[PDB]
Amino acid sequence: GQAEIKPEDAPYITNAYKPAYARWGFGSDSVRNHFIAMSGEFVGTFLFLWSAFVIAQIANQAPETPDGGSNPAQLIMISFGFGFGVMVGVFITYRVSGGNLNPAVTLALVLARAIPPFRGILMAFTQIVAGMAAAGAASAMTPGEIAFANALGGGASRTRGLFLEAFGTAILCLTVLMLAVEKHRATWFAPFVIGIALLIAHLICIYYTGAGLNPARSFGPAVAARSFPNYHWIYWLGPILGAFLAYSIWQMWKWLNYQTTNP
Amino acid sequence: GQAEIKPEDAPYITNAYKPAYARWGFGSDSVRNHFIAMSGEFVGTFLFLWSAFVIAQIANQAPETPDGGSNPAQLIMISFGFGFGVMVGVFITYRVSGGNLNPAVTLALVLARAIPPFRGILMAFTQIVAGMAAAGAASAMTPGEIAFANALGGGASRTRGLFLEAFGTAILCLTVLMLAVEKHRATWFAPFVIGIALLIAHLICIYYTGAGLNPARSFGPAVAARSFPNYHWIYWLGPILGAFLAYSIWQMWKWLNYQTTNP
Amino acid sequence: GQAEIKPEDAPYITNAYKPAYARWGFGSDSVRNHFIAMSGEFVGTFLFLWSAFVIAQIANQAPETPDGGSNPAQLIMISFGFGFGVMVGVFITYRVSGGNLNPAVTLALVLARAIPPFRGILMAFTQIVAGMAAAGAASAMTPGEIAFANALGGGASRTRGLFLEAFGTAILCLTVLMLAVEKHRATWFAPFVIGIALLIAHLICIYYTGAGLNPARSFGPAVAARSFPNYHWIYWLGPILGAFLAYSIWQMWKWLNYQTTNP
Amino acid sequence: GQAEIKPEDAPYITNAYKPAYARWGFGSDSVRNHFIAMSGEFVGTFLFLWSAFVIAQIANQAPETPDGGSNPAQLIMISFGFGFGVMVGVFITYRVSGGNLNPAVTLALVLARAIPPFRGILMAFTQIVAGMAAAGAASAMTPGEIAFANALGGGASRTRGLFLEAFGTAILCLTVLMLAVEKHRATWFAPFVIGIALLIAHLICIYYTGAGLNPARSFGPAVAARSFPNYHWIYWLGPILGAFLAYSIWQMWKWLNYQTTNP
Numbered sequence A, B, C, D: 001g002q003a004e005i006k007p008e009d010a011p012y013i014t015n016a017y018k019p020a021y022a023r024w025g026f027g028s029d030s031v032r033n034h035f036i037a038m039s040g041e042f043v044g045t046f047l048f049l050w051s052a053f054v055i056a057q058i059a060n061q062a063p064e065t066p067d068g069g070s071n072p073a074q075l076i077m078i079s080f081g082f083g084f085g086v087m088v089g090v091f092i093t094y095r096v097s098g099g100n101l102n103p104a105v106t107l108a109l110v111l112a113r114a115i116p117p118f119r120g121i122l123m124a125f126t127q128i129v130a131g132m133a134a135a136g137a138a139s140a141m142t143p144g145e146i147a148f149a150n151a152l153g154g155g156a157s158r159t160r161g162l163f164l165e166a167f168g169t170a171i172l173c174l175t176v177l178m179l180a181v182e183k184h185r186a187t188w189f190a191p192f193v194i195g196i197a198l199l200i201a202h203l204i205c206i207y208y209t210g211a212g213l214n215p216a217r218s219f220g221p222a223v224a225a226r227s228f229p230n231y232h233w234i235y236w237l238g239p240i241l242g243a244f245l246a247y248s249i250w251q252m253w254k255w256l257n258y259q260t261t262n263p
C-alpha cells in the first residue's frame, strides 16, 4: 500500500522547500553562513525592489486623474509590481535566506525567535543597502524625474497614514508567521501567500501613503531623490508597529497551542 | 523504494494543513477552544473586511462613469480587495478557526454538520462584531464620506439583487464544502479556491448590489454610516438562500457517494 | 526515516484529488453513475457560465471605445469571469464529473479514450442544457438587452474568427490532456492551469469573436436572444477543430512515450 | 502510521512532475529523444508566442494615450498574455522538453550544465523557428498592421533598454534555475513561478523596449514585419547578459552549498 518512489525522484521528496531560517541551528554563525544569508537578502531585495520601482515609475506616467481622484488600473499595476515582485523574490531566495526582503518582517521574526538578533541586524542592513542600490539603478535606468518615492496623497493625514502602514504591515508579517514560520503542509507555499498579502497591502496604501510597508523600500528612493519628507518617520514607525501587532497575535495563538484541540 | 524524510523535515508532512473544524471532536467545548475559534474568526474577519473596505473606499474615488455605465478597472480592484483579502485571511486562520469569515459560510457548515450549532452561533456573532470594528476602523482611517456600504445600482431591482446575492453566495459556500469540508489531497489549497470564488462573486454582484455575500460585510458599514436601506434584508436573505442551495447540492452528492464508482 | 501520518489525517493522503473520469472503470454504466456525472456537468457548467454571462453583461456596460478600438480593462474583466469562473467550476466538480464544462473538451477526451462515447454524449447534452439555463438565468437577472452573446468584432472576418477559435480551443484541450488526463504529481492542480488557459484564450478571442471556445457557451445566449448569426457555425467547427488538433499533439507524444528517456 | 495509497492512485505519486531535462541522462542522444525535445519546444513556444502576439495586437488597438503617457490597463493585458501564456506553455511541455520556450533560458541552462550544448542549440533553433511561425500566424489571423513587434518607447535610450532587458531576463532565468533546475518539493510548481517572473518582466519592459526578454520573441515579428530596427541587437545581447548574470548568481550559491547549514 505504498507508492514507489524511483531513486532519481527522491530529491523532490527529501529536499524540503522550507525557509532557510528553519534550519539555522548549530553551525549557523560561520562567516560562510552569514554571507549566504546576506547574499539571499541582497539578491532578493534588489530584484524585488528594482522591479517594483521601475513598474511604479511607468505606472506614474499615466495621465493625471482630475480632482485628486484615484486610478484603479494604475493602482493595480503598482500593486502587481510589489506583490508579484516580492513573490518571485521570496520563491528564489526561500532556501538561501528565507526571503524576508523587508526589515519589518525580519523584526517580526526576531521577536518570534525564528531569527536571532545579530543575524537579524545583518539581514536588515543588507535589505536597506539593497533598497538604496535598487533605487539608484531604477533611477539610472529610467527617464524623467523619480516617481517611485513614497508620499502622502488622497487627502490622508500623517496619523491616518501611520495606521494604514501599521495595519498593512501587520497583515504581511502575520502571513509570514503563520505560513512560513509555522511548520505544516502549506509552508512550502508561503511565498505565494506572502506575495498576495503584499498585493493587498498596496491596494490599501498606495493612494494614501505611497505604500511603504518596508523601511528599505522607503529609504532608498528618498536617498536617490535627495529628499526626505518630514513625515518620513511614518514609514519606520508604522511598519515597526505592524511587526509588533503581528507578533502579538501569533504569540497569543502559540500560548494557546492553537492548532491542537487537546494539548 | 521510499524517499528519506529527515527528522527536521517531518513537521511539514505530519502537520496537516487542514481547517480547524475538521479536528473539533471530543474536548472542543472547553472555554479555551471556544476562545481559539472566536479569535481566529475575529482576526481573520477584521483583517479581510478592513482591507477590503479601505480598498473599496479608494476605488470609489475614481471619476464617475457617465450614463450609469460600468468601470471595469474599478470593479476589478474592488473584487481583488475582497477576493484576495479573504484568501489571505483564510490562509492565516485556517488552522485556528477554519477561516469562515462569513456567517453564511458558517451556516452552510452547520447545515453540513461540519460545525455544531452553538459554536456556529459564537462564530457568526464574532464575525458580525469584527465587521462592525472593521467598518469603524476603515471609516476612521480614510477621508471623505463612507463609500464601502452596500447599495443597489446598475438598474437592478431588489428582486434581481436578491437572486444575484443568493447564487453568488452559493458559489462561495459550495467551494468551501467541496474543497475544505471534503477531505482529499486538495483540502490544503481550499483557501486559494475560496478566494477566487469570492473574486468571481464580486465581479457578478458589485455593480448591481454592492456585493454583500456576507451579512457581516453588509451590516458593519450600515452601522458606521448610520444608514440602513429598506432593502437591507436582501443582504441577509440572499446569502442565507445561497448557503441552503450549496448545502442542498453537497448533500445530494453525499447521498450519492459521488466520489466512488462502486460503493 | 518516514514521517508519521496521524490516522485522522490519512484521508488527505489516501483520497486522491483526481478527475472522476480517471476512475470510471467497471461499474460506471449504472444509472447512478451516469446521473452523478450529469449532475457534476450541470452544476459546474451552470455556475461557470451563469457567472461569466453576468460578468460579461456588466463589463459590456462600459462607455463605448471610439473608432472600434479595444478596451483592455473590459477585456481583462470578461476573461476573468470565464477563466476564474471555469477554475472554480472545475475545482468544485473535479471528483464528481471531472469538470469538463465544455463539449469540445469532452470531445478531446472521447478521442483520447479517457471518456467513452455514450457517457461523452450524455455529458455534452448536459452542458448544452446547462448553458441554455445559464443564459436564461443571466438574462432574467440583469436589466437591459443581452450583451453576452457571441459576435464577430474588431474587423475580424469569419475565416479569421474560425482559426482564432480553433487555436484557442486547442490550447484549452491540450491543457486538460496534459495536466488532468496524464497522471502525475501535478494532476491535482489541473483545474488551476485549465482556468488560466481559458483566461488566455479569452484575451485572444473576445475582441474578434466574442470568445466562444465552447459550443454550450455560444448556443445558450443565441437561444435566449432569439438570434443566431449566419456565422454561428464557427462556434461549433472552430472548437471541434481545436479538440482534434489538441488530441493529435497528445497522441503523437503518447506514441513517442514522451515522458520516458529509455522506454 | 503510513496512509494507504490505493494502487490506482500510485501514478500520482510515482510519476514526478519534473522538467524533462532532469532525466536526460544516458540514452538521450537518440533521434527519438532529440525529436521529443524539439517537439515540446516547438509546440510550447508556438502556443505561448502566438497567444501573446494576438493579445498584444488587440491591446495595441486601445486609443492612444496623450503626451507619450503610459496606459496601465493595456500594459497589464500584454503582461498577462506573455506571463500567463508562458505559464500554460511550460505546464503543458514540462515533461516533454522542460518548457524553456526561450533561447536565453536554454543558454542559462547550458551554462548550468542542466542541458548539453548540442541539445541546447537544437532547442534554441526550434524556438526561433516557432517564433517565426507564431508571428506569421498571428499576422495572418488579425486585421491591421502588425502591432506586436518590439520597439523602444517611453523616452528610453538604447543603453537603458539594454539594461532593462538584461535585468528582466536575469529574473526569469534565476527563477528557472532556482525553482526548476534545483530539485526540491517546489520543483513541480516552477511553471507558475516562471510565468509570474515573465509577467513582472513585462510590466518592467513593455513601455520602454516592447519587452523582448527572449530572442525568439523578438526575431519572429521583425521577420514578419520585414523590419529590423538598427537597435535590434539589444534584444539579443540584453537577454544573453541576463542569462549570464542569473547563471553567475546560481553558480555562487552552488559553490557555497547554499541550502545546507553544515556541509
Ligand SMILES: CCCCCCCCO[C@@H]1O[C@H](CO)[C@@H](O)[C@H](O)[C@H]1O
Residues within 6 Å of the ligand: A023, A024, A025, A026, A027, A028, B008, D260, D261, D262
Ligand atoms: C561535538 C558536538 C557537535 C554538535 C554538532 C550539531 C550540529 C547540528 O546542526 C543542525 O543539524 C540539523 C540536522 O540534524 C540541521 O537541520 C541544521 O541545519 C543544523 O544547524
Ligand SMILES: CCCCCCCCO[C@@H]1O[C@H](CO)[C@@H](O)[C@H](O)[C@H]1O
Residues within 6 Å of the ligand: A137, A140, A141, D157, D158, D159, D160, D163
Ligand atoms: C546596473 C545598472 C546600470 C544602469 C546604467 C543606466 C543607463 C545610462 O543611461 C543614460 O543616462 C544618461 C543620463 O544619465 C542619458 O543621457 C542617456 O542617453 C541614457 O542612456
Ligand SMILES: CCCCCCCCO[C@@H]1O[C@H](CO)[C@@H](O)[C@H](O)[C@H]1O
Residues within 6 Å of the ligand: A158, A159, A162
Ligand atoms: C493616533 C495616535 C498615535 C499616532 C499619533 C501620531 C502623531 C504625529 O504627530 C506628532 O505628535 C507628537 C506627539 O504629540 C508631537 O510631538 C509631534 O510634533 C507631532 O508631529
Ligand SMILES: CCCCCCCCO[C@@H]1O[C@H](CO)[C@@H](O)[C@H](O)[C@H]1O
Residues within 6 Å of the ligand: A228, A233, A236, A237
Ligand atoms: C526614527 C526613524 C528612523 C529614521 C531612519 C533614518 C532616516 C533619517 O534620514 C535623514 O532624514 C533627515 C530628516 O530630518 C535628513 O536631514 C537626512 O537628509 C536623512 O538622510
Ligand SMILES: CCCCCCCCO[C@@H]1O[C@H](CO)[C@@H](O)[C@H](O)[C@H]1O
Residues within 6 Å of the ligand: A255, A256, A257, A263, B031, B032, B033, B034, B035
Ligand atoms: C494549552 C495552552 C492554552 C493555555 C490556556 C488558555 C486558557 C485561556 O482561555 C481563554 O483565555 C482568554 C484570554 O485571552 C479568555 O479571553 C477566554 O475567555 C478563555 O477561554
Ligand SMILES: CCCCCCCCO[C@@H]1O[C@H](CO)[C@@H](O)[C@H](O)[C@H]1O
Residues within 6 Å of the ligand: A260, A261, A262, B023, B024, B025, B026, B027, B028, C008
Ligand atoms: C475517558 C475518555 C476520554 C476520551 C477522550 C477522547 C479524545 C478525542 O479527541 C479527538 O482526538 C483526535 C485524535 O485522535 C483529534 O484529531 C481531535 O482533535 C480530538 O478532538
Ligand SMILES: CCCCCCCCO[C@@H]1O[C@H](CO)[C@@H](O)[C@H](O)[C@H]1O
Residues within 6 Å of the ligand: A157, A158, A159, A160, A163, B137, B140, B141
Ligand atoms: C485601529 C484604528 C485606529 C485608527 C484611528 C484613525 C485616525 C484619526 O485620524 C484623524 O481623523 C480626524 C477626524 O476624525 C482628522 O481631522 C485628522 O486630521 C485625521 O488624522
Ligand SMILES: CCCCCCCCO[C@@H]1O[C@H](CO)[C@@H](O)[C@H](O)[C@H]1O
Residues within 6 Å of the ligand: B158, B159, B162
Ligand atoms: C422572485 C420571487 C422571490 C423573491 C421576491 C422578493 C419580493 C420582495 O418584495 C416584497 O415582497 C413581499 C411578499 O410579496 C411583500 O410582502 C413585501 O412588501 C415586498 O417588499
Ligand SMILES: CCCCCCCCO[C@@H]1O[C@H](CO)[C@@H](O)[C@H](O)[C@H]1O
Residues within 6 Å of the ligand: B228, B233, B236, B237
Ligand atoms: C431579518 C433580516 C436580518 C436583519 C438583521 C438586522 C438588521 C436590522 O437592523 C436595523 O435596521 C432597521 C431598519 O428598519 C433600523 O431601524 C435599525 O436602524 C437597524 O439597526
Ligand SMILES: CCCCCCCCO[C@@H]1O[C@H](CO)[C@@H](O)[C@H](O)[C@H]1O
Residues within 6 Å of the ligand: B255, B256, B257, B263, C031, C032, C033, C034, C035
Ligand atoms: C451509493 C449511494 C447512491 C444512492 C443511490 C442513488 C440512486 C439514484 O440514482 C439517480 O437518482 C437520481 C435522483 O436524483 C435520478 O434522477 C437518476 O435518474 C438516478 O440515476
Ligand SMILES: CCCCCCCCO[C@@H]1O[C@H](CO)[C@@H](O)[C@H](O)[C@H]1O
Residues within 6 Å of the ligand: B260, B261, B262, C023, C024, C025, C026, C027, C028, D008
Ligand atoms: C465478478 C467480477 C466483478 C468485477 C468487478 C471489478 C470492479 C472494478 O471497478 C473499478 O475498481 C477500481 C479499484 O480497483 C476503481 O478505481 C474504479 O473506480 C472501479 O471502476
Ligand SMILES: CCCCCCCCO[C@@H]1O[C@H](CO)[C@@H](O)[C@H](O)[C@H]1O
Residues within 6 Å of the ligand: B157, B158, B159, B160, B163, C137, C140, C141
Ligand atoms: C434562478 C433564477 C431566477 C431569477 C429570476 C429573475 C428576477 C425577476 O426580476 C424582474 O424582472 C422584471 C421583468 O422580467 C422586471 O420588471 C422587475 O422589476 C425585475 O425585478
Ligand SMILES: CCCCCCCCO[C@@H]1O[C@H](CO)[C@@H](O)[C@H](O)[C@H]1O
Residues within 6 Å of the ligand: C158, C159, C162
Ligand atoms: C481557411 C480555409 C478554411 C476555412 C474556410 C472558411 C470558409 C467559410 O466560407 C464558406 O466557405 C464554403 C466553402 O467554400 C462556402 O461553401 C460557404 O458558402 C462559405 O460561407
Ligand SMILES: CCCCCCCCO[C@@H]1O[C@H](CO)[C@@H](O)[C@H](O)[C@H]1O
Residues within 6 Å of the ligand: C228, C233, C236, C237
Ligand atoms: C453544424 C453546426 C452545429 C450547429 C448547432 C445547431 C445550431 C443551429 O440552430 C439553429 O440555427 C439556425 C440558423 O439557420 C436557426 O434558424 C435556428 O433558429 C437555430 O436554433
Ligand SMILES: CCCCCCCCO[C@@H]1O[C@H](CO)[C@@H](O)[C@H](O)[C@H]1O
Residues within 6 Å of the ligand: C255, C256, C257, C263, D031, D032, D033, D034, D035
Ligand atoms: C518508444 C516510442 C517511440 C516510438 C518511436 C519513435 C521514433 C521516431 O522518432 C522521430 O520520429 C519523428 C516523426 O514524427 C521524426 O520527425 C524524427 O526525425 C524522429 O526522430
Ligand SMILES: CCCCCCCCO[C@@H]1O[C@H](CO)[C@@H](O)[C@H](O)[C@H]1O
Residues within 6 Å of the ligand: A008, C260, C261, C262, D023, D024, D025, D026, D027, D028
Ligand atoms: C550496458 C550499459 C547500459 C547503460 C544504460 C544506463 C541507462 C541510464 O539511463 C537513465 O536512467 C535513469 C533511471 O535510472 C533515468 O532517470 C534517466 O531518464 C535515464 O537517462
